[PDB]
């Protein structure tokens, strides 16, 4: 079985959640295997993305529907060609 | 081989550094924008305790 | 043992005059048998039901894999001798029953297809398994290239089963995109109640078995049945069904699934009526074989359907190859050959089969009678435990219609039975070749099993209880 | 003429036969099985005589197999 | 996932409603088993997940057999007949 | 740059949508696997796009230098009849190919949500509106790349498959010979 | 030569003590009984057996006749596969303790015995990384449930044999 | 008991025997030597279903 | 923009700019004579597609198995040393497995394409 | 004798890919800044010369081996924003 391989032969993006839900499973037994569940959870949840888009959905929302402007450290782009420049 | 395993801490180290950095950065940025709304912005989508930087950014 | 014969026999077969086929044919045959006798024992190793993973998790071996695996072997003896052995010394015989050169090879090569489905533990394991058994099961078709009908059925086959074997990919894949896993183990119940897995299993379950044919998708399967040469449909229209049902019941994916049940009803339905007003003897067994599958494909829908199931499987195969037996039997009693690919055609084709050869009549009566369900054959069995894991589980309207498609089916079950013993006019007397040995006895032991195979039904469930529970 | 005298019949002089009139085929076969017969016959003389086989490389960090130590120098 | 996924569909429906000619069923073949290489490619790189690239070698290998024995078939049925029709099956 | 070179992405998709149409619509079956071959040099775009300039390589290799040689090789060798598209033969397609293209569609994009809400699992479909972030670590110190970690994988963790391939490629091999060659 | 991952410790498959859960080829070879040699010598001459007993029920050209030479060398070479088959299988289960094992048991705690006062690893010295070993394992142990199917051996010295 | 079982399944390999005879369009006894080796063969089979049974039956018992 | 993708960019505007020159500068007076395939001077008749041997199919189907198999060991030579000694077996059975094939190929001729016509080597014999 | 009429054009084809090697070395080490072409760089050499570019300011190549780094290099750490690989 290939499964927990990346594409460089280490451990895939997901492994530590998906180890840490075996860890559970392992543990537990058929009836208190909900007990597992938050750990599936932040298994998928690594896999998929889900709350984390729902959570920029929200705050993207309310950021386009303010006009007060906003005083915090900053992101800024930059072309390729000026890493480092200044 | 060796040569690059002597190299690897101080280099995870710096990351590491600004890893930390940037996160604490995005999660002020963010409870700021929110600041007047009923969100909570420091509660982690993940249920263990853990440190999650984040994925997926905002486009800029 | 088996990869071992398919290499020794391209090689040996590639240095071998076409004369020597049946010789060869033979050799194998004595070689099954060996291996089925010598390493038998090994059932030991899945005493308590005690179960391996294999290769890297890649595949599995228990007590239920292995009687698959055993009755496999069994069913390819039986096959290999159909052309191993002339059934008589004419010259019309060789015209009709000669192997090709390739063939052994493709029906062993196939057979490795069908038993590495059945040990599938991984996805990967499964779709390089049933491609391998596709592929094969393409081939068989084609290799009578002289028969247009057989030809069009190759060519029929490919394109169908290679869009269903497209929907399977595709359903492997989706599983994959979900759970970042390509096996069923990682599947646990809190994984099923956390998520929707039900349209990805069920097409996985559609694409698998709309390969051996269920309704609605089932006359393409059995205008290949009856386009293939009598000696190839015997085989095609078994190994597969027996290697993907397999795997399904083991798997259990599609418990209490409603698509499924309806599907099952469907299948009972068409498979029933669909066979009343068919006239060739071939198209009539498809049917047959419809309505089994239909009944098979009931026990997806619980768990614990290992014994009813291998019940089912094991005396359906043993039914399926008598018929097929006592119908090449038959042909040397007909009038008139219809061509060299399938000499026989037509039921009417067996009137008054009774007065040329009486025990052979005596034979089809067994096997008609156990298809349709009559205590003590066989099949009464096999029907009563479906039945018995049916209402365990609460299918009341599903058994309610197996019991109407059973009665609907023993029609055209009848129907050999009933022009088989009619009169005839000119009637045989004597002569002076007979049917082969080997074959007649083989043909002997089914309708033995057939008959008084209940007589140890208890022994068995002894058996059973210590190596499946 | 020259025809095939059978592998069976006699060994020698059918691979006598086959140098003589199937040299493709008789020295691919020749170059195919001589590979894998040396691997196995040849390579534990050559650890035995020649030299050992090398020590493995590293593919990753080596973490010590221990308990953190207290230590002591650089701090804040 | 879009790209993979249509050329998937439109592929089977290209293979289901052909009334024209055999190779078309021939190309929507192949051309299924592409769009579903692609799907299955691009989660294995959002997963950093080589089991996703294994069975998508294992598909190409498999893509290049069938159409072996595939057009083998089509040769064997084309013997005994000299010519396709556009039912050619 | 950044216009065209943002949406490379949607200019391959939408050019495998005109070639299927027109790998569908050929007057020539030539033509047809002229353009599948085109929609293959379009499925190794993607795939650069995407990360997998490897497989963009083996695609080139393996389906046009060989699949699609074979498929010119076999249509030259071979007598074909071919109707063209007309309405008189295929308009009478055209509701069921409206049906099936919205309900395969709509169905292929939902069957990888994990919403208990059906209109919910089409929605997430149309959810990527983010960007990954891309991050450097430097745990790993070998130039392993994938086609090495495929190698090592195959050969190692699942080398059963690797010879059960060999079975499947001894049938690509025997098959044919088989069915295309008359013996004796 | 020290395992990567845990393992069952005398884990039961049967009714005898475990001796080696991935017996090596060497080994299972080596413990073999004479009554596995005349299984092997059994099978060696049954199917040739079988190839004369068949022409004589149904002979292959109506007048009987001996199978050529080349067919009796094709039986009598894949009658010994079978017969070595069957011997293998047969010690393995010794080695699993599914069969009767005692005598297997005590030479095994002799062996080893004598291997621990040469300084010598308990399962021998690997050419392999231990990840390998791992690997070379988890592709071997019980792959003998597949004898029907495909043959598959233990070649590789690793530390993976269920034992204390 | 394990002589009835030996008997019964011999009898399984005569009623083989008698019906591949009359199949064959064959009297009854027509190679009397083929009824004793039915009959070994299918009391072979029996006697080894019998085993695995006895053996079923005391691993059920020791597990007590 | 790097040289690679530059110049995989010049390639083909090159040839279209030469096919261009052709284009504008030759004469083009088609016509019918002119516009004869040529066979050699003379004209044939139009034929059904010519039956040919089965060994021209066999050569290019046999080419995509051999191809695959060729090209599935990409990977190993690309993973030799991390699999070093365990994927060397591996590998040789998997050549050897190919290998049997390739002897099944030989030794029924299957690229071999028969002269039909043979010269006749039977006796003469009058019948006194 | 040697026919040197026939080696004229064999002449000019080694003349000029031996021309246009040489103006094309000449041509990377001028695109370097005055060293050789990096090459079979994998990720891990790709890392860093991006580094390498924090460090410098930008200039390509550059290299310095002063103990601590610039204060700019605190702060001109750059992620990347990858578009959604639909
Ligand atoms: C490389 C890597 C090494 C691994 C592979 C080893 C291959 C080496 C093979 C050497 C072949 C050299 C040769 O010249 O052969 C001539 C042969 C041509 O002969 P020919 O006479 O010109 O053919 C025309 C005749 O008309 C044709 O006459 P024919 O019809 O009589 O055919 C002649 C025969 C010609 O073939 C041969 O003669 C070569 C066969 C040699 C291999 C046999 C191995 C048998 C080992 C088991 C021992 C069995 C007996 C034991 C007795 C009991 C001991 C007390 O053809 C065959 O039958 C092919 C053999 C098919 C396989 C049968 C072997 C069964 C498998 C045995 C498994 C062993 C399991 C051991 C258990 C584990 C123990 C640790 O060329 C080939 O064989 C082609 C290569 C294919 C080889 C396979
Ligand atoms: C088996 C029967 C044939 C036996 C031949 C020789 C046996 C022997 O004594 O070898 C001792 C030999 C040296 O013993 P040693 O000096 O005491 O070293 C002690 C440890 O082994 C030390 O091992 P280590 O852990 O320190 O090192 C790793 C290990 C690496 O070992 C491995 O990685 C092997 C793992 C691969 C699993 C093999 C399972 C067999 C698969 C058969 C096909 C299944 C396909 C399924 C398709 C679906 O050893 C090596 O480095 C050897 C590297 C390669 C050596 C040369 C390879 C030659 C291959 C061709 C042999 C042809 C023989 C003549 C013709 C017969 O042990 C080996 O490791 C050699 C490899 C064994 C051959 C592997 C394949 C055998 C042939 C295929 C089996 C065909 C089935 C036939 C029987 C089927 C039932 C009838
Ligand atoms: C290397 C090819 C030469 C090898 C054999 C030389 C034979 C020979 O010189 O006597 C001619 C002689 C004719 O007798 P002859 O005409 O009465 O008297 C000769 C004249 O008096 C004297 O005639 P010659 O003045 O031609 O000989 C003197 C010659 C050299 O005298 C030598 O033999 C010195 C020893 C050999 C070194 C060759 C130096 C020149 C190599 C040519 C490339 C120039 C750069 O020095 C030159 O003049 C060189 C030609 C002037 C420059 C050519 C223009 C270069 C354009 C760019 C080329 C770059 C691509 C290459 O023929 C023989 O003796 C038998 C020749 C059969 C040769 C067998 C194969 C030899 C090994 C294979 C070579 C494969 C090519
Ligand atoms: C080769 C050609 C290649 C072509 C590829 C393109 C195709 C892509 C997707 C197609 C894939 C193949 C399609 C196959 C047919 C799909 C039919 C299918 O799966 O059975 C259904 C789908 O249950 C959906 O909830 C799924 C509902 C369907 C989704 C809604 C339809 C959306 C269309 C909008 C209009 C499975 O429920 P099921 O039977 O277990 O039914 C019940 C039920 O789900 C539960 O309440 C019970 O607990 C459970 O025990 C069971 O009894
Ligand atoms: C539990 C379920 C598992 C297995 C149960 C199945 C079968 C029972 C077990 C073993 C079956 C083996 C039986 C061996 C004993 C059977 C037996 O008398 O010989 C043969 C058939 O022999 C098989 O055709 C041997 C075929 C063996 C394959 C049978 C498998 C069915 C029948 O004699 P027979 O007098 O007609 O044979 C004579 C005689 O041999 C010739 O010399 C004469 O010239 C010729 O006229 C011929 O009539
Ligand atoms: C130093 C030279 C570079 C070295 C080698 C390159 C070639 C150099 C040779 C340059 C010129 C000689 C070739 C010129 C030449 O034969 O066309 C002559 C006319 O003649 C001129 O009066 C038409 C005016 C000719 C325009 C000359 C342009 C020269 C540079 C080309 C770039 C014959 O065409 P033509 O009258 O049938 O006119 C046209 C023409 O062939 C097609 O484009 C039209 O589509 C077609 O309708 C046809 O009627
Ligand atoms: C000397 C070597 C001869 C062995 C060769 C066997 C070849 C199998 C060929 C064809 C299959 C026919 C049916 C197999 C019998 C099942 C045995 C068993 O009891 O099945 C059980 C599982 O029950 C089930 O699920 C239900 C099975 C349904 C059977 C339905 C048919 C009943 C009628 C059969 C009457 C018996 C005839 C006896 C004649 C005197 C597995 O038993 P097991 O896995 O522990 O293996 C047995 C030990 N063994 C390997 C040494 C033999
Ligand atoms: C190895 C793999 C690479 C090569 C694979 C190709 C195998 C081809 C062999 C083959 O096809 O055998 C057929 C040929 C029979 O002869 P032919 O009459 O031409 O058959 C044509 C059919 N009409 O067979 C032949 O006549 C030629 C083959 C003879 C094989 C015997 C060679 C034995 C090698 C002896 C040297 C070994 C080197 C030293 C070994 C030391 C340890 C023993
Ligand atoms: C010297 C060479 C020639 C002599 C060979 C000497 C061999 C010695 C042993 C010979 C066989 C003895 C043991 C087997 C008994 C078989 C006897 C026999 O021939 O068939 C028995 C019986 C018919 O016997 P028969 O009287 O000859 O009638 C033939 C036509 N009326 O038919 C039957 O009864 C069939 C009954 C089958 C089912 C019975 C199941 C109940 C248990």
């Known amino acids: 079985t290939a499964a927990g391989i990346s594409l460089t032969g280490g451990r895939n993006r997901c492994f530590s959640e998906w180890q840490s839900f075996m860890h559970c499973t392992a543990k537990t037994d058929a009836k208190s295997r909900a007990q597992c569940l938050p750990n599936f959870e932040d298994y998928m949840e690594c896999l998929h993305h889900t709350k984390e888009k729902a959570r920029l959905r929200e705050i993207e929302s309310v950021l386009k529907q303010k006009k007060e402007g906003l005083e915090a450290p900053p992101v800024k782009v930059i072309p390729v060609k000026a890493i480092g420049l200044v | 081989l060796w040569a690059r395993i002597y190299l690897m801490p101080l280099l995870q180290a710096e990351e590491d550094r600004q890893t930390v950095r940037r996160s604490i950065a995005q999660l002020e940025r963010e409870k700021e924008i929110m600041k007047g709304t009923g969100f909570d912005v420091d509660k982690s989508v993940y249920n263990d305790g853990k440190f999650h930087a984040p994925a997926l950014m905002i486009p800029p | 043992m088996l990869i071992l014969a398919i290499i020794s026999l391209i090689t040996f077969v590639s240095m071998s005059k076409l004369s020597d086929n049946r010789a060869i044919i033979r050799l194998i045959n004595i070689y099954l048998i060996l291996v089925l006798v010598l390493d038998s024992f090994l059932y030991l190793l899945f005493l308590n039901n005690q179960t391996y993973t294999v290769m890297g998790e890649l595949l599995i071996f228990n007590s239920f894999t292995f009687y698959i695996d055993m009755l496999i072997y069994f069913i390819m003896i039986v096959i290999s001798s159909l052309y191993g052995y002339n059934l008589y010394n004419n010259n019309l015989y060789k015209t009709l029953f000669e192997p090709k050169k390739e063939l052994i090879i493709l029906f062993l090569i196939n057979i490795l297809g069908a038993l590495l489905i059945v040990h599938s533990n991984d996805f990967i394991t499964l779709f390089v398994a049933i491609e391998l058994q596709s592929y094969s099961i393409y081939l068989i078709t084609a290799i009578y290239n002289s028969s247009y009908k057989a030809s069009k059925a190759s060519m029929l086959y490919f394109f169908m089963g290679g869009i269903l074997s497209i929907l399977i990919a595709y359903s492997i894949n989706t599983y994959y995109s979900v759970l970042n896993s390509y096996t069923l183990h990682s599947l646990d119940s809190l994984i099923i109640n956390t998520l929707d897995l039900n349209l990805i299993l069920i097409a996985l379950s559609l694409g698998l078995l709309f390969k051996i044919g269920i309704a609605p998708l089932h006359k393409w399967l059995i205008s290949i049945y009856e386009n293939t040469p009598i000696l190839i449909t015997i085989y095609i229209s078994l190994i597969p069904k027996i290697s993907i049902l397999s795997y399904l019941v083991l798997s259990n994916i599609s418990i209490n699934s409603l698509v499924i049940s309806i599907l099952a009803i469907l299948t009972l339905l068409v498979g029933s009526v669909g066979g009343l007003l068919q006239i060739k003897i071939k198209r009539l067994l498809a049917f047959s074989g419809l309505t089994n599958a239909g009944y098979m494909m009931l026990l997806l829908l619980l768990n614990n359907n290992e014994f009813s199931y291998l019940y089912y499987i094991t005396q359906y195969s043993i039914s399926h190859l008598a018929i097929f037996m006592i119908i090449i039997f038959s042909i040397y009693y007909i009038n008139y050959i219809n061509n060299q690919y399938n000499p026989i055609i037509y039921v009417n084709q067996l009137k008054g089969l009774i007065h040329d050869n009486a025990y052979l009549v005596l034979s089809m009566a067994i096997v008609v009678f156990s298809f349709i369900g009559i205590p003590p054959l066989l099949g009464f069995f096999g029907k009563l435990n479906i039945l018995m894991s049916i209402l365990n589980n609460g299918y009341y309207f599903i058994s309610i219609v197996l019991i109407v498609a059973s009665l609907i089916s023993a029609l055209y079950y009848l129907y050999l039975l009933n022009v088989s013993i009619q009169d005839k006019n000119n009637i045989l007397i004597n002569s002076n070749e007979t049917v082969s040995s080997v074959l007649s006895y083989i043909l002997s032991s089914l309708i033995i099993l057939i008959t008084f195979g209940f007589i140890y039904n208890s022994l068995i469930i002894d058996i059973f209880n210590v190596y499946f529970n | ?76 | 996932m879009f790209i993979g996924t249509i050329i998937l569909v439109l592929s089977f429906l290209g293979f289901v409603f052909n009334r024209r000619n055999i190779i078309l069923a021939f190309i929507c073949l192949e051309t299924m088993l592409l769009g579903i290489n692609l799907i299955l490619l691009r989660n294995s790189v959002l997963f950093d997940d080589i089991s996703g690239s294994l069975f998508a070698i294992v598909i190409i290998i498999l893509a290049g057999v069938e159409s072996a024995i595939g057009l083998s078939l089509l040769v064997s049925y084309y013997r005994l007949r000299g010519v396709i029709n556009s039912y050619g099956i | 740059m950044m216009y065209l070179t943002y949406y490379f992405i949607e200019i391959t998709i939408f050019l495998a949508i005109l070639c299927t149409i027109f790998i569908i619509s050929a007057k020539n079956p030539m033509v047809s696997i002229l353009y599948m071959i085109a929609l293959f040099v379009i499925a190794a775009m993607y795939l650069y796009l995407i990360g997998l300039g490897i497989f963009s390589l083996l695609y080139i290799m393996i389906y046009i230098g060989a699949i699609a040689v074979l498929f010119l090789f076999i249509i030259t060798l071979l007598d074909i009849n071919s109707t063209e598209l007309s309405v008189k033969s295929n308009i009478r397609d055209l509701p069921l190919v409206l049906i099936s293209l919205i309900v395969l569609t709509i169905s292929g994009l939902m069957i990888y949500s994990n919403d208990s809400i059906l209109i919910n699992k089409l929605l997430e479909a149309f959810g990527n509106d983010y960007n990954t972030i891309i991050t450097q670590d430097w745990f790993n110190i070998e130039n392993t790349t994938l086609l090495t970690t495929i190698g090592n994988v195959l050969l190692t963790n699942n080398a059963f498959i690797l010879l059960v391939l060999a079975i499947v490629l001894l049938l690509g091999i025997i098959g044919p010979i088989s069915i295309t060659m008359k013996h004796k | 030569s020290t395992p990567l991952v845990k393992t069952s410790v005398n884990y039961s498959y049967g009714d005898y003590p475990l001796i080696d859960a991935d017996p090596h080829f060497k080994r299972v070879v080596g413990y073999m009984r004479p009554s596995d040699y005349g299984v092997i010598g059994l099978a060696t001459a049954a199917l040739p057996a079988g190839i004369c007993f068949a022409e004589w029920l149904d002979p292959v050209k109506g007048k009987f006749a001996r199978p050529s030479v080349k067919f009796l060398r094709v039986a009598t070479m894949l009658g010994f596969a079978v017969g070595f088959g069957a011997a293998y299988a047969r010690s393995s289960l010794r080695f699993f303790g599914v069969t009767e094992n005692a005598r297997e048991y005590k030479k095994d705690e002799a062996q080893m015995a004598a291997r621990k006062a040469a300084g010598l690893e308990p399962y021998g010295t690997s050419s392999l990384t231990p990840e390998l070993q791992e690997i070379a394992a988890k592709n071997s142990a019980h792959s003998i449930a597949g004898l029907f199917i495909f043959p598959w051996f233990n070649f590789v010295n690793h530390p993976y044999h269920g034992r204390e | 008991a394990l002589f009835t079982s030996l008997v019964g399944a011999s009898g399984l390999g005569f009623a083989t025997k008698f019906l591949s005879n009359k199949i064959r369009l064959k009297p009854a006894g027509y190679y009397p030597l083929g009824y004793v080796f039915s009959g070994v063969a299918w009391a072979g089979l029996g006697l080894v279903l019998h085993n695995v049974h006895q053996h079923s039956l005391e691993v059920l018992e020791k597990k007590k | 923009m790097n040289t690679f993708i530059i110049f995989i960019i010049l390639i083909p505007i090159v040839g279209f700019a030469l096919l261009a020159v052709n284009i504008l500068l030759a004469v083009y007076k088609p016509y019918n004579e002119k516009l004869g395939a040529f066979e050699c001077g003379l004209t044939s008749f139009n034929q059904t597609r010519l039956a040919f041997n089965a060994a021209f199919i066999l050569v290019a189907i046999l080419f995509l198995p051999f191809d695959l198999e060729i090209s599935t060991l990409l990977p190993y030579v690309m993973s030799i040393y991390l699999v070093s000694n365990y994927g060397f077996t591996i590998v040789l059975l998997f050549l050897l497995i190919l290998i049997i094939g390739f002897v099944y190929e030989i030794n029924t001729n299957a690229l071999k394409i028969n002269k039909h016509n043979k010269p006749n080597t039977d006796s003469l014999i009058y019948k006194l | 004798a040697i026919p040197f009429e026939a080696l004229l054009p064999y002449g000019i084809i080694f003349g000029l890919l031996t021309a246009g090697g040489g103006a094309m070395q000449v041509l990377h080490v001028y695109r370097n800044g005055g060293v050789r072409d990096r090459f079979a760089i994998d990720q891990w050499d790709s890392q860093m010369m991006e580094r390498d570019l924090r460090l410098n300011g930008g200039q390509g190549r550059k290299q310095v081996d002063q103990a601590t780094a610039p204060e700019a290099f605190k702060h001109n750490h750059v992620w990347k924003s990858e578009r959604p690989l639909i």
Do not use: C, M
């Not at chain 4, 090398?54 to 130590?69: F, G, T």
């Open chain 4, 1 to 76: 003429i020259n025809a095939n005298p059978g592998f069976w019949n006699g060994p020698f002089r059918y691979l006598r036969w086959s140098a003589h009139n199937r040299p493709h085929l008789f020295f691919a076969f020749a170059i195919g099985i001589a590979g894998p017969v040396a691997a196995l016959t040849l390579t534990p003389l050559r650890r035995k005589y020649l030299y050992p086989d090398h020590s493995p490389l590293p593919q990753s960090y080596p973490l010590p197999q221990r308990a953190r130590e207290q230590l002591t120098g650089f701090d804040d």
